[PDB]
Ligand binder design. Structure first.
Ligand SMILES: Nc1ncnc2c1ncn2[C@@H]1O[C@H](COP(=O)(O)OP(=O)(O)O)[C@@H](O)[C@H]1O
Lengths: 369, 191, 180, 191, 191, 179
């Protein structure tokens, strides 16, 4: 196992040295770890743990310790992000396969292009996935990498950069954190030459810097977010008969991404507009965050179910998804609380209650300290 | 004159003709007497639309008083050949050739405006020459007439004898009568 | 960059590439194989005409535009790979299945796939334009996913035989986990 | 010769013809004798404006001396089908077909300049040929006459009997008289 | 009017007319009476395509009623001169010198639509003047006739006597009949 | 340029900006304000037609097309600055004249500008197209410049006690010179 595992997960080190390193560390760890209740023998599980520490990647013992975490990964991500279950299943299933031993030998854990409307959770599910797994989040904003010359920074440094620290941002970031989530927001904005860089990442699992250091992407989840097809879908036809502009989104995606790049993608997820039922869950989530913020100042907030529904109708916009909910939450709740928090009953004591009258159609805020 | 129009695209602002802008949305216009040049133009438009998105169905607005039969048949063949369903709408009036293209639309996608009109008559063509030439020329008129009636009967679903009796002389069919005849599926009202 | 092509002219015509220091490398025994996706968009798109056109030739014209004539003359031959036919796809599916079995052998589970099931996988994932990569994804979505949950969450933690069959009435695959 | 006009935009100056510039403001122009090709343009302009803003109201300036009725039906049917209310303003003169489109405007949005004239009369179509053919063509125009009178009576609000007696011969109505007849709601004035 | 179509490319957006866009796809339209000016345009298109891709196949949609025989030979010479296989399709009617170009396509690539009609007849031309000149001109019109029959025989494969007998009088051949005669390899009849 | 909006997306969405150099700029306290004149042009201009179409919603339509939905979604709120009505216009002239009075107060000069003069100053000072930007010159040129010239060298060297009143015939401001 030491030899076979070293070849797979330990790079930039030759085989007779890699195995001896694993073998030596296993003897050192077992000898001095248990003061009492010490195993004289060195089982295969010890070797797997050693390689995991050296490579900063989980071992193959997930069937016992982390089985609970993976089982509840999808459920926990549903609470944080409502709707878009197809994206959660794709990410969690891709992870399960890798831990179970069915992941691609020379490709990343996953490569998913999340395309959809604004405020639908394209960049939220990725941030929550990393938090759920407790792994570093590598976030790259492609808005910076608009031109061809900026792309070189990912795999190196500008021409003739005699100064040190000439290592690629993407290559060095991945090497520091082999297990992490790689988010390339607004990948459409990036120069077409950036798609050529990812071909070896998705298909070969490694990207090489100009210096020659090999970055391993076999254990990183690659997620890209684009708003390529929202404009085409929102476009309205000019004719007597309305057109079903359902496939127009994919056609735009096909033009922006060459077939070779799309083929490498594990799955293309199309996020959809938030439904009215889903908005109710979103209102509850924002209120929960507000409660946490108030808890820091010692204020407790309780809202009536009726008031929650009223907030949903005011902020429900198909085009803007869930982001407008924050605005109504800010205007309706944060504005009165802010004035009172600075000066008034909310300085201390909390015990806030919110209700509304159907005839008035306006929320009522009552503070009793 | 043709009024230009503005379209807002992801790339930015773009200026299109009135007909060109409608072509982007798969709306093709058939207007005036059928002729080889305009028929060829419609044929070209259909092929371009198929390449852009074969799944999406094509829309054709037919407002024509009838014209050359040979030119029109090229349009019909192209409509059936291409995978997209060529929806047909009768704006104002449709003649025998115009109505032949209207009925040729896919099932469930043929429409007629409420105040639209239709006309169907046998093909009228005259040749002058020797009796021997007339015999060969006359035979083609009978063959095409049968082919047109057979195709018309196929789309409408009515008996060939009924199509032959009605086609013998000019017959005007209003929008409600066309639906019963089978030329069009239904009238377009508040889509 | 086009400069790379100029660097290979002596590699293929003379066999020796020299470093800036002046030492010469020998390429007389190194098999040189280049891969290009030129004209892929031309093949993917469909000609605007009644008769579909084979865009294999369009790729060759693109090759001429990208590569200089001197570079192309030195080449032994330009091999134009062809699309995967339905017949070879069945062989391709068998290749991925054995790769899956090797991964499964380490876990201790043996997989058995009926011939009818293998054909069903091919039809669902067949895409001439996308080649063989979709076949891996359909197998991953259909075969690897159920096995992964079972291996982690139950019925396959301990090595057991697996059997796959196709239900003609339902047109869906079936599985027998059969632990131990 | 159509003069060009510059419209200032945030990005920069945009050059459009005078007709196209007004089309952006929903101001369509109907001019000259109605025909299959001008109607196709007019309906095309209406469809373009509908998708942009269906709530906003289109404005059709009618200055036509009359034309073929069949072509006009496409304009009439299109106006009724589209959600936007079509405001018809009679400039100079509105003949039988022009008046039909004018009265066909949405209620409350029809106007006539104080000096315009409105002429209404029965269609004057004619046909020649065999006695059997004349009967079918003659019968059809009476059917069309019924539709013109029934749709005119609906918009004007007068009884069908009243419309037929007045339309027996050419009747020229002044702008104030049009309001009484019910062809237009009011006379356009600068508020 | 000719519609303008936008070709999406990675480098950027490009605007082309409907006919020019099709030319980029190796599609040529031979529509209308054959003439020197129109034939020159087709000749120029073939040469441009040959240079762009000689190995690839060209297409020629023939929807024409025939015309000048000598002008058509410029296309026939160019079709055989250029390395590309000039596949031919027939839309609507094909007549004298229309069919000659339709049967000159590469073997296995000529096609006719189901409802397309093909006509073949001997050259028709007359000269008025002195008897000496009529004899010279008459010999010229006979020699050209034999050359077309020889060439038609080559592609179709029928003997010269068969072509001369049929071509003496106007002969209309349906789309399936053309396959039996050999003018076209087969009918497309594809979706 | 459109590329600038793409830079602001991460600013508003994430609150942190990374320069090409490599440093991490964290600015979560800075408030962000942008000023545009996109909607005013459509609303102020009348429709090109006999009928005046409703332009109430026209201003929002321009902003929707001019600014991408993603850019607008991140914004907290879009606030419209409405044209200054006559009632508020009186306050603007009051602030400018009172400001000048404060400056003159240290010097010892006093002013007694009439309320009617305020109305005439407002029309010239405020323009619908240019707003109150030309109003700067109207107050300084009409009031400060004539009196300032006299203060440096005039009939009255000092003492102030100046007064102003509207002149119907000359449309000019009276200047009082009491030593
Ligand atoms: N389904 C959702 N549930 C909860 N919050 C959501 C949801 N969709 C969007 N959000 C919120 O909106 C933001 C995410 O927007 P995002 O989808 O990244 O936008 P874009 O597609 O424009 O990049 C975050 O503030 C996130 O909390």
């Amino acid at each position: 196992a030491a030899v076979e595992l070293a070849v797979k997960y330990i790079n930039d080190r030759h085989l007779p040295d890699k195995a001896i390193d694993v073998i030596d560390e296993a003897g050192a760890r077992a000898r001095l770890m248990p003061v009492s209740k010490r195993k004289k023998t060195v089982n295969v599980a010890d070797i797997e743990s050693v390689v995991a520490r050296i490579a900063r990647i989980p071992e193959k013992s997930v069937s016992q310790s982390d089985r609970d975490t993976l089982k509840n990964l999808g459920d926990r991500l549903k609470m944080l992000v409502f709707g878009q279950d197809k994206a959660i299943e794709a990410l969690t299933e891709a992870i399960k396969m890798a831990r179970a031993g069915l992941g691609h030998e020379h490709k990343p854990v996953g490569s998913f292009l999340f395309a959809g409307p604004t405020g639908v959770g394209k960049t939220e599910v990725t941030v929550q996935l990393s938090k759920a797994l407790g792994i570093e989040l590598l976030r790259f904003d492609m808005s910076e990498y608009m031109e061809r010359h900026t792309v070189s920074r990912l795999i190196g440094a500008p021409p003739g950069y005699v100064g040190f620290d000439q290592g690629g941002l993407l290559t060095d970031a991945v090497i520091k954190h082999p297990h992490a989530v790689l988010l390339l927001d607004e990948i459409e904005k990036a120069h077409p030459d950036v798609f050529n860089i990812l071909l070896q990442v998705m298909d070969n699992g490694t990207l090489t810097d100009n210096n020659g250091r090999k970055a391993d992407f076999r254990n990183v989840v690659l997620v890209m977010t684009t708003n390529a097809g929202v404009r085409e879908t929102e476009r309205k036809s000019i004719g007597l008969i309305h057109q079903d502009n359902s496939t127009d989104a994919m056609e735009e995606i096909k033009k922006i991404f060459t077939p070779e790049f799309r083929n490498r993608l594990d799955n293309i997820i199309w996020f959809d507009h938030l439904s009215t039922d889903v908005i109710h869950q979103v209102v509850d989530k924002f209120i929960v965050e507000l409660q946490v913020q108030l808890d820091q100042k010692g204020v407790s907030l309780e809202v009536s179910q009726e008031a929650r529904n009223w907030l949903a109708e005011k902020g429900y916009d198909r085009a803007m998804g869930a982001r407008p909910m924050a605005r109504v939450i800010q205007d309706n709740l944060k504005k009165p609380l802010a004035n009172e928090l600075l000066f008034g009953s909310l300085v201390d004591g909390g015990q806030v209650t919110v209700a509304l009258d159907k005839e008035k159609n306006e929320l009522t805020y009552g503070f009793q300290s | 004159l043709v009024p230009m129009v503005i379209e807002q695209t992801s790339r930015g602002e773009r200026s299109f003709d009135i007909y060109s802008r409608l072509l982007k949305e798969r709306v093709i216009f058939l207007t005036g007497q059928v002729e080889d040049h305009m028929a060829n133009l419609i044929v070209a438009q259909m092929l371009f639309l198929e390449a852009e998105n074969p799944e999406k169905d094509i829309y054709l607005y037919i407002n024509s008083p009838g014209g050359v039969i040979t030119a029109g048949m090229s349009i019909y063949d192209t409509m059936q050949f291409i995978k997209p369903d060529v929806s047909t709408i009768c704006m104002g009036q449709a003649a025998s050739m115009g109505a032949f293209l209207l009925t040729a639309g896919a099932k469930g996608k043929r429409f007629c405006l409420p105040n639209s009109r239709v006309m169907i008559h046998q093909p009228l063509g005259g040749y002058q020459g020797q009796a021997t030439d007339i015999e060969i020329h006359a035979r083609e008129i009978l063959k095409v007439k049968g082919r047109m009636n057979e195709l018309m009967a196929l789309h409408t679903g009515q008996s060939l004898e009924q199509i032959e009796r009605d086609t013998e002389r000019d017959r005007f069919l209003s929008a409600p009568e066309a639906v019963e005849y089978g030329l069009v599926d239904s009238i377009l009202t508040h889509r | 960059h086009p400069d790379v092509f100029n660097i290979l002219l002596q590699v293929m015509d003379n066999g020796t590439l020299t470093d800036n220091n002046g030492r010469k490398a020998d390429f007389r025994n190194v098999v040189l194989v280049m891969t290009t996706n030129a004209g892929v968009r031309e093949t993917e798109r469909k000609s605007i005409g009644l008769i579909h056109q084979d865009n294999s030739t369009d790729a060759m014209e693109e090759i001429k535009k990208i590569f200089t004539p001197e570079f192309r003359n030195r080449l032994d031959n330009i091999i134009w790979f062809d699309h995967l036919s339905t017949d070879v796809i069945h062989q391709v599916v068998d290749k991925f299945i054995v790769e899956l079995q090797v991964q499964l052998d380490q876990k201790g589970v043996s997989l058995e796939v009926s011939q009818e099931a293998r054909n069903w996988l091919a039809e669902k994932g067949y895409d001439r334009a996308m080649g063989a990569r979709p076949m891996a994804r359909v197998i991953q979505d259909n075969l690897k996913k159920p096995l992964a949950n079972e291996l982690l969450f139950g019925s396959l933690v301990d090595g057991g035989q697996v059997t796959v069959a196709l239900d003609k009435e339902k047109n869906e695959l079936t599985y027998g986990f059969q632990s131990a």
